[PDB]
Design a protein around this nucleic acid. Structure first.
Ligand SMILES: CN(C(=O)Oc1c(N2CCN(CCO)C2=O)cc(C(F)(F)F)cc1C(F)(F)F)c1ccc(F)cc1
Ligand SMILES: Nc1nc2c(ncn2[C@H]2CC[C@@H](COP(=O)(O)OP(=O)(O)OP(=O)(O)O)O2)c(=O)[nH]1
Ligand SMILES: [Mg+2]
Length: 627
DNA sequence: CTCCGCGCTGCGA
DNA sequence: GTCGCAGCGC
């Protein structure tokens, strides 16, 4: 195709930079090749048609020194008041990282990612690939990717150095394929009214998500190995104690040789012979072994799936003098939530105690949320949304009882256990509060009486009286739920607070399980997704105002090249109703004021949003803050 | 065929 | 190598 090598002639280069400055929209494809590791060889630009303007950064005019080329490169990729420029890149979060870390260019224009648009048009769709966006939106240029089998991988074609094709060809092909496909996706977004969401909350959230990836969460490898050795010892003692409690050895992973010990060798009560966790919690009250196996599964899940993984992905930050974990973002969820991968620092286990030693042992707290530490002379500011997924239900269902218990102040999860266990509300521990939290949310979202009785440890008909009490007590929640399945059946889609549409065609299926899944999924999506929006619209506005009062830097990777006092706040992790920031000592109070002022001013609902700000030297060592 | 929802990950088949 | 089951987390 038309591949203009702009860096070949001096007059040809300056004409490309002149035309580049008149563009209010263009495309980029970072070209990366092997060393013979990654290495940005060049770049690709497109403003229309099948013209690709390769920007070699390594056959070239000697008068165009690399340094003179990099000045013009940053002269066109930086904002200058009302430039109105909107770039289109295939992987914005990783292209913004590679450009900042391998070239020194901190992008400041507007951004448009075709992958985000493909998800915003169908959250249930498959992860977009360049072959999946061309086949669906630009099929008339599909014969271009012929031979380029790398188009079927989520890695950008220009960033896939493993392909035998040159980095120039791979980037030039992608530059025109993503520019024209974005014009088609922009035409579809403008039709469904969702174009504003793509550029006002969604794509600017991926910018904050690219910043947190360069920042990374702190990690204390010494606190991990200490918490590990306490856990392995209890694991080592649970095996020996359990193997004496049964007389013979038995693998805690073989449900066959476990049900033998419990239901047969120990004559424990029971469809039957199930070593499930819902059953072993009921049998926990009869023999020490049903509780020792549940502890074996808790420690093993930690010392294998949160400990050993975290001590693998740890990296050194020589500038900050720390060892920080570098997770990966993933916003491709059906509810709009943001999850993390490699490693998932969202699944870090909660604070749990182990009792080791003679007599009644000795209490030993194991908070694995505690090795995550701030920088020298820093803090970790966490801000909760209280009960966001229930205050939203109050704004939609308008139930006069859910709003009553919301303004009261009681912990309704504890109050559920007070009615369940017939215990004082203040006596409800966290283990029972979490079990009652699952009972609270599941019953609202359509938990059956069979699963309720199995969790509650009571009969099916006994648990059915608890469900029918909820329907009678809270009556506005079901008026909306029956009206929600009315609006999803007539339309075939559920809409969030921002207009995002999840398409549920299974609500008309002939199978009762299939209609129920979509019926249930419709009620969760309208409230789980509306919460992921309220978080996202707050996440962007907090980085916006932190960038206003900005005598600081905006990311640890940004300041890694400018080098100095680390003064500003930083992003690290986002839980589905809680935002964590790594603020610096000097302005712990200012950021906490911005994080909380914006998390409330993010949306305006019937029920005002309550936000609880906490602060400390660890994600587990958190204490309240006044703001 | 089988009835809260979303999400990731290691092991075993 | 690939996917299901089940462990934890919102
Ligand atoms: C019938 N029942 C109940 O009502 O529990 C609540 C409650 N509570 C908590 C205390 N309480 C008394 C007046 O406030 C009340 O109504 C609140 C809510 C929500 F605030 F979220 F709306 C949801 C639920 C529910 F669990 F039903 F979903 C119940 C069901 C299973 C159990 F193990 C214990 C109780
Ligand atoms: N359906 C469903 N949603 C859940 C479940 N656990 C968490 N969620 C969703 C709904 C609430 C939201 C926040 O979860 P958290 O665990 O932060 O809960 P919380 O009740 O807001 O927290 P707390 O009262 O302890 O501050 O995530 C669950 O088991 N089922
Ligand atoms: Mg919470």
């Amino acid at each position: 195709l038309s591949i203009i090598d702009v860096a070949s002639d001096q007059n040809l280069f300056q004409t490309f930079i002149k035309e580049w400055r008149c563009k209010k929209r263009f495309s980029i494809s970072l070209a990366c090749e092997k060393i013979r590791d990654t290495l940005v060889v060049g770049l690709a630009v497109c403003w229309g048609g099948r013209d690709a303007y390769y920007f070699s950064l390594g056959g070239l005019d000697p008068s165009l020194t690399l340094k003179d080329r990099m000045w013009y490169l940053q002269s066109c990729l930086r904002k200058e008041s009302d430039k109105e420029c909107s770039v289109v890149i295939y992987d914005f979060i990783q292209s913004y990282k590679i450009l900042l870390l391998s070239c020194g260019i901190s992008l400041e224009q507007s951004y448009e990612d075709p992958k985000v648009a493909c998800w915003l048009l169908d959250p249930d769709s498959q992860e977009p690939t360049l072959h999946s966006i061309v086949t669906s939106f630009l099929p008339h240029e599909l014969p271009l990717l012929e031979g380029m089998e790398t188009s079927q991988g989520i890695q950008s074609l220009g960033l896939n150095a493993g392909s035998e094709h040159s980095g120039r060809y791979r980037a030039s092909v992608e530059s025109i394929l993503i520019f024209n496909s974005m014009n088609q996706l922009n035409s579809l977004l403008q039709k469904e009214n969702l174009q504003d969401v793509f550029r006002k909350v969604e794509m600017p959230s991926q910018y904050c998500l690219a910043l947190l990836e360069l920042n990374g969460i702190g990690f204390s490898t010494a606190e991990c190995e200490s918490q590990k050795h306490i856990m392995q010892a209890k694991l080592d003692a649970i095996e020996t104690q359990a193997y004496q409690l049964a007389g013979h050895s038995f693998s805690f992973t073989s449900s066959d040789d476990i049900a033998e010990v419990l239901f047969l060798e120990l004559k424990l009560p029971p469809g039957q012979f199930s070593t499930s966790k819902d059953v072993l919690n009921k049998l926990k009250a009869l023999h020490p072994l049903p509780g020792l196996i549940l502890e074996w599964r808790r420690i093993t899940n930690a010392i294998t799936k949160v400990v050993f993984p975290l001590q693998r992905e740890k990296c050194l930050n020589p500038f900050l003098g720390m060892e920080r974990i570098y997770p990966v973002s993933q916003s491709h969820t059906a509810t709009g939530r943001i999850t993390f991968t490699e490693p998932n620092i969202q699944n870090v286990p909660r604070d749990f105690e182990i009792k080791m030693g003679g007599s009644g042992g000795m209490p030993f707290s194991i908070s694995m949320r505690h090795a995550f530490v701030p920088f020298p002379g820093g803090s970790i500011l966490a801000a909760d949304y209280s009960q966001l997924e229930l205050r939203i239900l109050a704004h939609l269902s308008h139930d006069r009882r859910l709003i009553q218990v919301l303004n009261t102040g009681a912990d309704v999860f504890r109050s559920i256990a007070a009615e369940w266990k017939m215990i004082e509300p203040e006596s409800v521990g966290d283990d029972l509060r979490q079990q009652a939290k699952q009972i609270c949310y599941g019953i609202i979202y359509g938990m059956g009486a069979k699963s309720l009785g199995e969790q509650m440890g009571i009969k099916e008909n006994d648990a059915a009286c608890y469900i029918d009490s909820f329907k009678s007590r809270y009556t506005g929640i079901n008026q909306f739920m029956t009206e929600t399945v009315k609006n999803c059946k007539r339309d075939g889609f559920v809409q969030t607070i921002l207009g995002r549409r999840r398409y549920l065609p299974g609500i008309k299926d002939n199978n009762p399980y299939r209609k129920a899944h979509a019926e249930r999924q419709a009620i969760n999506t309208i409230v789980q997704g509306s919460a992921a929006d309220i978080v996202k619209i707050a996440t962007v506005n907090i980085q916006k105002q932190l960038e206003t009062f900005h005598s600081t830097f905006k990311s640890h990777g940004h300041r890694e090249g400018m080098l100095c006092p680390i003064r500003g706040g930083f992003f690290i992790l986002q839980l589905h109703d809680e935002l964590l920031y790594e603020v610096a000592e000097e302005d712990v109070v200012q950021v906490a004021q911005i994080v909380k002022n914006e998390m409330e001013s993010a949306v305006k609902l019937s029920v005002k949003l309550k936000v609880k700000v906490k602060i400390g030297a660890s994600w587990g060592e958190l204490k309240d803050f006044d703001v």
